[PDB]
Amino acid sequence: MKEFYLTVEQIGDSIFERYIDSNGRERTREVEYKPSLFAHCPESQATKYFDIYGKPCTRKLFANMRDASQWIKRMEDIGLEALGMDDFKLAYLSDTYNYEIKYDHTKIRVANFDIEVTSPDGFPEPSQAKHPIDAITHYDSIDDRFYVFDLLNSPYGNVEEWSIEIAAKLQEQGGDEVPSEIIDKIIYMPFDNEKELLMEYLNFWQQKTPVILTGWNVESFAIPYVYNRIKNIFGESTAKRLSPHRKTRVKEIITLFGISVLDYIDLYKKFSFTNQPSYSLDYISEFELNVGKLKYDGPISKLRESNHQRYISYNIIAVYRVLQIDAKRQFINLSLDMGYYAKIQIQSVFSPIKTWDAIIFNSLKEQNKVIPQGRSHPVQPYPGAFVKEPIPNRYKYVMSFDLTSLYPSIIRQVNISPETIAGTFKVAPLHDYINAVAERPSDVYSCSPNGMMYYKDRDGVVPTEITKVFNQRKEHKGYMLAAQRNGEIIKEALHNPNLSVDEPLDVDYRFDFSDEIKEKIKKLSAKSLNEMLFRAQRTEVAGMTAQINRKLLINSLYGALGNVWFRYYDLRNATAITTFGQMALQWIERKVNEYLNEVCGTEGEAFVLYGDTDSIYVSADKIIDKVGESKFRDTNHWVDFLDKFARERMEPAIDRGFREMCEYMNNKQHLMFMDREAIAGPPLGSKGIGGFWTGKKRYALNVWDMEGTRYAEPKLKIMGLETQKSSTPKAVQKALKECIRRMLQEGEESLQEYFKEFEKEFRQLNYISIASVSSANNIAKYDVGGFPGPKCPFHIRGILTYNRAIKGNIDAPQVVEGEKVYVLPLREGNPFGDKCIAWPSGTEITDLIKDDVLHWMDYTVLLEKTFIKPLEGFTSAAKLDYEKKASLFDMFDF
DNA sequence: GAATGACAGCCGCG
DNA sequence: GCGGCTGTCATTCA
Question: Residue A759 belongs to what domain range?
Answer without folding.
Answer: 721-772+857-879
